[PDB]
Structure 1
Amino acid sequence: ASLTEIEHLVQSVCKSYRETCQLRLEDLLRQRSNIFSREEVTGYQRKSMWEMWERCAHHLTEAIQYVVEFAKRLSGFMELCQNDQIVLLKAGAMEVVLVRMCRAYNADNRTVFFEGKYGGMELFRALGCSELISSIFDFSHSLSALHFSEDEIALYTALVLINAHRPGLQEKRKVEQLQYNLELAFHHHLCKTHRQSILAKLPPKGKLRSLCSQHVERLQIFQHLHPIVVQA
């Protein structure tokens, strides 16, 4: 495609992101000084595994709704058939949530914004999967080190989601073409803003998939269907 087309794709992906970013970055940043006390930590830690999983499913669900609304504003995505839309969301909506997560993560003290205050990974002890949790914290930590702008997140997440490697696609060449255009958009934007250097520092592609499918598997143990599926 032309320069004008690539520019228009950059603008439309960032617009769609901006409209669906769930919480404003400034609100997340302002809250950084607001940290759970030890007593509040041990209040979280003493909760039933069932209660913590319920909370964490509910945050996952709500964050995924914003990601599906992101996908719905990418005119490329609304052109795909229904099965291919489901395939991309089922594999990618939760991966996008885990990238967006880095906005709510404070690298200075290794804490995340969770339910009104920042807390460290020990807040989630009642989840009973401390290796998974610690790895999630390492992944967000590696993302924080890139210092993403809002627009880099938009462009990077569009690529996470519009992904021709997902198994089960029916219009693979079409998804490949959309993905190709989105890579051009991302690359162009980074060159224009003197930020090409991040491309070599992005996490290995399978890392994100592995972190998500371990979450999905724990949700399944706790009787929650894939969080793309409407439940209550």
Structure 2
Amino acid sequence: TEIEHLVQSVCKSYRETCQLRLEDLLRQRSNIFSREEVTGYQRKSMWEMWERCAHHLTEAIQYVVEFAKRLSGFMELCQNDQIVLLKAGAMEVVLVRMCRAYNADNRTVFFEGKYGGMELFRALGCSELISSIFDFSHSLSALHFSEDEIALYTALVLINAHRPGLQEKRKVEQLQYNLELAFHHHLHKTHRQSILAKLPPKGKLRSLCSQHVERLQIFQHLHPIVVQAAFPPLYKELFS
């Protein structure tokens, strides 16, 4: 029963920190940016679009930081390992969470109140990277992740004892094994083990995420935003 409590605890932590409600996102799908509104975004300076997207991305990260802080055992890890896992994993989770806000039928994402395609972001001059991010969401879309599946999967994205730099590797392994059992137990209970063979290769998410964060650090270097840090040790690593 300790595992069934873990399943419930992870799904609750996700429910409290998912940022956008799935029902709102599904019902808002017919609300799509017009030709004119899309041109309004394309005409904004790179630096204004950077400011908008940087702040949306930091805020999304902060919801993932909160999600992690409510996973059982995460806070009992030493602070160095908290940073290690979140630095490597929190943006991976944001990229996974994107698929809920992404409509595969027209290849649009929910952005500032409406759905728009990737050409909304033309002014940023990162079409290849942004296209990669949209492609990743598109492939995740085919799984039709339930809310509980995405809760358990993104927990496992964070709690990964293979991250370089961990000090108490055994403690992370214990949490990881419990979450893996929780995930696999729940998939069996719901007759959804078929998604296992369809999850993305682990190297794919890490590769895409490194390219994403790389571009973000280049913008941040040219045009630094600042936010009130949720997790200052983690913040002061990437922004300072």
Give the gaps of 5 or more residues in structure 1: none
- Asked if structure 2 preserves the Cα contact closer than 8 Å seen for 1:16 and 1:70, the reply is yes
The CA distance in 2 between the partners of 1:228 and 1:55, in whole Å, is 10
CA drift at 1:210: 1.7
1:57 and 1:227 in contact (8 A); partners too = no
Would the aligned equivalents of 2:99 and 2:137 in 1 still touch at CA under 8 Å?
A: yes
- How far did 1:223 drift? 2.4
Contact 2:6–2:72 under 8 Å retained in 1: no
How far, CA to CA, are the matches of 1:226 and 1:202 in structure 2?
A: 36
Which residues in structure 2 correspond to 1:1-232 (within 5 Å)? 4-223=1-220, 230=227
Unaligned runs of 5+ in 2: 229-239
**SS class of match (2:160):** coil
Whole-angstrom CA distance in 2 between matches of 1:75 and 1:133: 34
Contact 2:54 2:225 in 1 (8 A): no
Contact 2:49/2:123 (8 A) holds in 1: yes
Contact 2:3-2:182 at 8 Å conserved across structures: yes
Shift of 1:229: 8.6
Q: CA RMSD in A?
A: 2.1
Q: Which deviates more from structure 2 when the two are superposed, residues 37-46 or residues 104-113? A: 37-46
Does the CA contact (< 8 Å) of 2:51 and 2:225 recur in 1? Answer: no
Report how far residue 230 of structure 1 moved.
4.8
User: Which runs of structure 1 show a deviation greater than 2 angstroms over 4 or more consecutive aligned residues?
Assistant: 223-232
Percent of residue pairs bearing the same amino acid type: 99
For 1:228 and 1:210, how far apart are their aligned partners in 2? 25
Counterparts of 2:27 and 2:53, CA distance in 1 = 23
1:216–1:226 CA contact under 8 A, matched in 2: no
CA distance in 2, matches of 1:228, 1:207: 28
Q: Which moved more, 1:74-83 or 1:205-214?
A: 205-214
Between 43-52 and 216-225, report the one with greater CA deviation.
216-225
Q: In the aligned structure 2, how far is the partner of 1:79 from the partner of 1:50?
A: 40
Per-residue CA deviation, residues 97-126 of structure 1 (Å, 9 max, x unaligned), is 111111100011110000011001111111
SS at match of 1:51: helix
CA-to-aligned-CA distance 1:170-203 (integer Å, 9 cap, x gap):
0111111111111110000000100000000000
Work out the number of aligned pairs and report it.
229
Once the 2 structures are TM-superposed, how far is the Cα of residue 208 of structure 1 from its aligned partner? 1.3
Secondary structure, counterpart of 1:229 in structure 2: coil
Deviations along 1:32-84, one digit per CA (max 9) or x if unpaired, are 00111111111111111111111111011111111111011112101100111
